[PDB]
């Protein structure tokens, strides 16, 4: 299985403007990437890859409608800014299982500020002194974190 | 090779006695023919084979293109001979030959033994991870004891290990799989899948699954452990004068509850018999009907006895009073009414046995030998086991005498019922009083003085190992081996779920089940409404899962057709008892909604499908405009964790897609995929020729016959023609259903039985 | 066939089945076959009736299961079969009156809402029509018929009544019961709805029934008669009766039984007046004289081997002069010294092969020509001096003394060791750590015992004769009597005990004898005491010096004769070293059960806390005497090689009879006051052994002696 | 390294599965080592 073959499963081949979410899940990618998805997409919501062993965030169609975004269990450890030059329109942000070294890989998330959720489970970051805190005061946007902000509400 | 089958078939015809043999000796008579053999069997094989090994070439050789790789005689040794033989018509060889064999020649595949032999490969990883202790050299005590010599993967009766054997590795002449191939459906597909691959000669494979299903069991000699695992190793374990400490590399208890669950449901109604049985062979424990661990053991509690005879399986003709097995030795007793007053001043008629009588009793792990006259307990002896297990044999069998001393013994009352609310029989009444109130007969009996002697030494009845025992009471420094000639005798069954023997004498009674309930350490799935609604929410939750998950394609079906019918099933009105009733009509409106989008926009998705199907039972109650109410978390019975997420998932359902798994519950269950694909897969085992019915005889219309592959290429309700078992020619119909016979005989009974009440 | 019934049905079916039969007053049990025949009528009924409803409209139609609309899901099919006589009646007239329909005159089987019609299902062995005309004609068109046969075919009154599946159901499960039926082979026993009221018929004939007649006991004159008188008679007290008339002089004879009862066995042993017993043995035991070479460990064929033996011994080999000190009653010396020449030309002889060069003077030699000569059985009636041999007897001989000799010497330790036993794997249990070191234990003392030499020489000449037996069956051979000695240093000394020429041995049977003479080195010189050798003709060929003292070397000639049966418990005399172990095995886990520990150290050598352990082993001027641990095993191991050596019938005998003293002994030692019937018949049982066998003539003298000391012992 | 662990179940506390595992370890302590446990609440003194 490829991305291909996830892209066309979802789309059912009708045009790529058809769709506003996406499912690249347990999809194989060259090099730890996500290819498969042109630039030509101008409309999405949602988005979803998990298990696909992405190791940076280079490629990713510039957009101005998607509100969240999940990446999980890859070893990604690069700078997030490149997100604010594609789609500087965040609102949900899943890293539970990513892998990031320090304080420092989470710093680019500043410029942006429609972020109101950000996920980060049994991050080798998420371990240390005032690490919540320390997270608060560095993303003010921020309204959410792993759940426990002030109270427990749902995406 | 087939050509040289027919040219052997006519060659051997055209002598006339094969001739008239063949057309006289029908299929089944074959065993007969094989049988007439020589018989001239050796009278010493050790001198045999000591002259064997030193001859020329005694090994026999079968014909083939084998010794080619060989020459007729190696570095100056001769191998192998070209003269011909008589006695199998191959060659002869050599040892010689072996030796070079297992030196050089052709390398084989190395695959079919990880698989093949796998008892024999768990035995040594049983062995190899096995962790030794200390050597106890004192006097080991061992009982005499039927014990299972070998583990078995899934123990089954020898007929239906034979035809597990003929379905897994002899795909042709499978006619008519019986009711035997589903309840196995998962080894058949485990074994088939695992053998498969192979060139081992079939017979050595037929003989191994032998081994590894059908049981063998022995008298041994045992002290301390006695499942299979232990016994394997008994011969160092064990010793006369020496002990070790040995650690070899569940249903059970799930079982006895099923079984005593099913007693009291179909106890309390009238024709307990029909009801019970329904419920035993339409329970299923996780794989298969109950009728797949009952079959295993051999006896078991007195629920599972009882069931057992319900059923159709051989019990232990032991007869159970209480927790008592007891097993006459001799005499005869006469059961005559008396009137006798109790201890409490009150005056019961009941049955006395006239006579005397002895009886070896068991309980627990306490056995012994009573010896009782009417109205009075002569002896009794016993081995030291067990505190509570001598307690409870000391009581049960003075309440089984009925000894007098017993009756003037009571002191509070005897109007006790069951768990069912019924009055039960004066001795079930003493039994329970006495059990309850263990020192009541205790203390009014009377002592005796210890038996004065090398051996024997009395008991208190406090149960230590005290003199000044109880009188008769005896404690024996000796192994008592009692239980001999388990004829299993031929036993009747009552309606009222009552064995009884040959005559009218009773054996087991309804009663005898002790009301104890334990947690089902198994997912106890039944299929019939009345069973379930006892248990808590969680449970009744997980059988209307398990319900919809088992016939999903029933339901699958009537979805598409897209009417209410689907909903108004019995299935969930048992749910309906677990749903708020100020809320659970929103649930069903809303949830019908969801529903009808997804027929309607939407393609086909089982996890939420049958997450949202279950709620529709009750009648919905739509908004004031008339749109269905729009929830996201199901609110269940209990609160808290009792509540099933509409997104994704719950404590009590969750659904995960990368890996296509089902939890329900806190138990995880394979949904492969989707699709009527991951219904055959699911199919995968079920037996070869089982989608086929019979009908009709040969019909050559349809030319020579067809295998199984081009079988399954005809569409439902074809006819073809195909052979049954060795040879038979027959017509077979493709079935377009799956077919249950005890579903169908259990509703006849229902109808027939509500016909007789309706008339009544 | 009722397992069958249990098996196959459930138990409701069967309940209906029998509640039908009690109504007929028909015993389930008595007409099993019926049983079955009405169980699977009512299966048949019911497997019609599911599934198959009716829809609003009136159209039949599948209803799902588990899966309830309402309350009514109108069935298209009402059994009416199985219920009570008068609820059926009553149903069927409720049906007929509800829907307007003439009432069967005959009870129902089904009733069909649709057609809505009374439907009669049958079953038949035989064909479909045959069954459905005969149906009809009883019943007539007022009910519709559908027939099921067992081969597969059947007959209906309308084809639309049931689906393809239900008629392939139907059949799939008659055709299951059949081959179920033809597996337990009920089939052909099993009769039909019109032969089951027949019954199983097999009666006597003339000649049966007539045997039957005369052979009935005394006072009778017809065996139905007889049976008569079994059936209706009532015995209430015939054996008290019988009792009260039959002679008093018929009893047990009980008496109790003292030590003053019991009296030595076989008291001929101790009068000289007669012969004393021979040396019977096959081999030399206590007398054996081994030439022995050293040799690097390289395993040969026997040929070589004593070739190279007697090269060694140059002097022995080439002795020619021969100086008789014994010709012992019947064999000839110039037979046997040129017998024995010969046997060393060939031992010493540049071919390989081992059969002897003559082949005509051995023939003399063994005697195998002195054999008679078989006539018919005409000429034997006819003649007159062709008598019977009267059976020869085995003589009634005294106590030797080579036995005891013996039965010391070979239970002493010696330097040299021959016993090897091969490896087994790693032991990782303690368990297998505990019993390595008893078998550690064990072989340290057995293997330097002479007794274990002995039993390894006769291991190895049996096998080895066997072997050439098997090979050569018609051809003299020459096989040397080889053994294979480690001393303690670790030399494989090869050694030479003799050789023996074997007859001709071509024999299908196994209990047909072949004849052997043994030809022994020996260094006894008989004439220290002749009576243990009155079978042996012996020479003098020589001399030998083992360190310096120079000792005879003398060659004991016998010709003797085996058999196949003995030929194998030859190699299977290994045994005798389980029989010691097993024993001492026990002993010392009685031990162990004492005191926790483990005590194979304690009892062989001893600790600092026990002493060793001392059994009471022999005696000497009437004052017995303690023997270590090992060498009670060795007295054992001895005991048991002897048991073998001296076997024969006069052994079992002596022994499986003789247990019953040893028993009756060991009750009155623990004071059970064992009683006896008839003591005199046990002591006669057990003394017609004692002959002639000289193991048999020291187990009774050694009883007496034991029994003596008992009794001495026994004031206490 | 000396630790058994399994997985019993998955609790949920703001919608979100979380796994949850069981740490089985066997372990030797003597009367002293409870002694010195039960006092290790000094170290609120210590610090202060």
Known sequence: MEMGRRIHLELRNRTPSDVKELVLDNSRSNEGKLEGLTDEFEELEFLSTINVGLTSIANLPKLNKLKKLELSDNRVSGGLEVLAEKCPNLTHLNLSGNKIKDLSTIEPLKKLENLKSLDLFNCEVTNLNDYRENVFKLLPQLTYLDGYDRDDKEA | ?760 | MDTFITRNFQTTIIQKAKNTMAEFSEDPELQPAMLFNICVHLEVCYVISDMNFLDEEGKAYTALEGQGKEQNLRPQYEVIEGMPRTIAWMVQRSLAQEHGIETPKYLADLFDYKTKRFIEVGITKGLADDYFWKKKEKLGNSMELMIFSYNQDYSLSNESSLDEEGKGRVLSRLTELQAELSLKNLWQVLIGEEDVEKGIDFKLGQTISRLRDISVPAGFSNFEGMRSYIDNIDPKGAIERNLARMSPLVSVTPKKLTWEDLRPIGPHIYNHELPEVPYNAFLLMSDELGLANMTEGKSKKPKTLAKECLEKYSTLRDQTDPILIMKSEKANENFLWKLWRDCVNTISNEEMSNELQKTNYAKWATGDGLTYQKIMKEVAIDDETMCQEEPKIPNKCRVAAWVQTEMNLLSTLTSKRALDLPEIGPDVAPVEHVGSERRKYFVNEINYCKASTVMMKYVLFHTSLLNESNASMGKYKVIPITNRVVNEKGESFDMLYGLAVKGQSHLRGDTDVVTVVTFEFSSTDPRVDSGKWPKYTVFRIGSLFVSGREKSVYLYCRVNGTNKIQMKWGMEARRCLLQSMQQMEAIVEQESSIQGYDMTKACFKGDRVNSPKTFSIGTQEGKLVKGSFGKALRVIFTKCLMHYVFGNAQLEGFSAESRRLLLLIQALKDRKGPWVFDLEGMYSGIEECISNNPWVIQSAYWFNEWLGFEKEGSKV
């Open chain 2, 1 to 760: 090779m087939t050509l040289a089958k027919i040219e052997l078939l006519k060659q051997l015809l055209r002598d006339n006695e094969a001739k008239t043999v063949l057309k006289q000796t029908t299929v089944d008579q074959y065993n007969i023919i094989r049988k007439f053999n020589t018989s001239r069997i050796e009278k010493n094989p050790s001198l045999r084979m000591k002259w064997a090994m030193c001859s020329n070439f005694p090994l026999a050789l079968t014909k083939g293109d084998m010794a080619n790789r060989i020459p007729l005689e190696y570095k100056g040794i001769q191998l192998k001979t070209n003269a011909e033989d008589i006695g199998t018509k191959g060659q002869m060889c050599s040892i010689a030959a072996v030796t070079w064999w297992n030196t050089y020649g052709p390398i084989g595949d190395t695959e079919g033994f990880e698989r093949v032999y796998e008892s024999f490969f768990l035995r040594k990883m049983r062995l190899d991870n096995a962790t030794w202790g200390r050597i106890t050299f004192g006097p080991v005590e061992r009982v005499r004891k039927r014990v299972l010599l070998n583990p078995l993967t899934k123990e089954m009766p020898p007929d239906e290990a034979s035809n597990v054997i003929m379905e897994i590795l002899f795909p042709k002449e499978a006619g008519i799989p019986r009711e035997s191939t589903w309840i196995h459906r998962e080894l058949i597909k485990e074994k088939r899948e695992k053998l498969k691959g192979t060139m081992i000669t079939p017979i050595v494979l037929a003989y191994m699954l032998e081994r590894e299903l059908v049981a063998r069991r022995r008298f041994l000699p045992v002290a301390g452990a006695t499942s299979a695992e232990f016994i394997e190793m008994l011969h160092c374990l064990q010793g006369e004068n020496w002990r070790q400490i040995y650690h070899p590399g569940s249903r059970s208890q799930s079982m006895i509850v099923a079984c005593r669950k099913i007693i009291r449901r179909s106890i309390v109604a009238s024709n307990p018999l029909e009801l019970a049985v329904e419920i035993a062979n339409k329970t299923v424990i996780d794989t298969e009907p109950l009728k797949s661990c009952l079959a295993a053991i051999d006896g078991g509690d007195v629920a599972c006895d009882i069931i057992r005879a319900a059923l159709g399986l051989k019990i232990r003709q032991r007869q159970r009073f209480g927790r008592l097995e007891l097993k006459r030795i001799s005499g005869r007793g006469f059961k005559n009414d008396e009137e006798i007053l109790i201890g409490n001043g009150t005056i019961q008629k009941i049955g006395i046995w006239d006579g005397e009588e002895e009886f070896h009793v068991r309980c627990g792990e306490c056995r012994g030998i009573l010896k009782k006259s009417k109205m009075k307990l002569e002896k009794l002896l016993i081995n030291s086991a067990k505190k509570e297990d001598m307690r409870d044999l000391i009581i049960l069998c003075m309440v089984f005498s009925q000894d007098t001393r017993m009756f003037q013994g009571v002191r509070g009352e005897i109007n006790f019922l069951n768990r069912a609310g019924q009055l039960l029989s004066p001795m079930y009444q003493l039994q329970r009083y006495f059990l309850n109130r263990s020192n009541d007969l205790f203390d009014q009996w009377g002592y005796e003085e210890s038996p004065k002697a090398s051996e024997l030494h009395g008991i208190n009845e406090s149960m230590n190992a005290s003199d000044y025992t109880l009188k008769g009471v005896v404690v024996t420094r000796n192994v008592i081996d009692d239980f001999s000639s388990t004829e299993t005798e031929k036993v009747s069954i009552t309606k009222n779920l009552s064995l009884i023997k040959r005559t009218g004498e009773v054996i087991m009674g309804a009663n005898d089940v002790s009301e104890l309930e334990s947690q089902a350490q198994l997912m106890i799935t039944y299929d019939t409404p009345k069973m379930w609604e006892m248990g808590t929410t969680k449970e009744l939750v997980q059988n209307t899962y398990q319900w919809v998950l088992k016939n999903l394609v029933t339901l699958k079906a009537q979805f598409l057709l897209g009417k209410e019918d689907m909903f108004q099933w019995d299935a969930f009105e048992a749910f309906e008892s677990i749903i708020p009733q100020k809320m659970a009509g929103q649930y069903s409106g809303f949830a019908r909604a969801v529903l009808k989008q997804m027929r309607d926009q939407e393609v086909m998705k089982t996890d939420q499908f049958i997450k949202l199907l279950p709620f529709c039972f009750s009648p919905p109650k739509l908004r004031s405009n008339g749109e269905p109410y729009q929830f996201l978390k199901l609110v269940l019975k209990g609160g808290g964790e009792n509540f099933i997420e509409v997104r994704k998932g719950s404590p009590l359902f969750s659904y995960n897609p990368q890996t296509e798994v089902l939890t329900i519950c806190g138990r995880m269950m394979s949904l492969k995929g989707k699709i009527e694909d991951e219904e055959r897969n699911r199919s995968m085992g079920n037996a070869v020729l089982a989608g086929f019915l019979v009908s009709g005889k040969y019909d050559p219309d349809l030319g020579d016959f067809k295998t199984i592959e081009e079988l399954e290429k005809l569409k439902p309700g074809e006819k073809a023609n195909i052979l049954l078992y060795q040879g038979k020619p027959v017509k077979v119909v493709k079935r377009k259903r799956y077919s249950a016979l005890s579903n169908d005989i259990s509703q006849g009974i229902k109808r027939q039985r509500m016909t007789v009440e309706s008339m009544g």
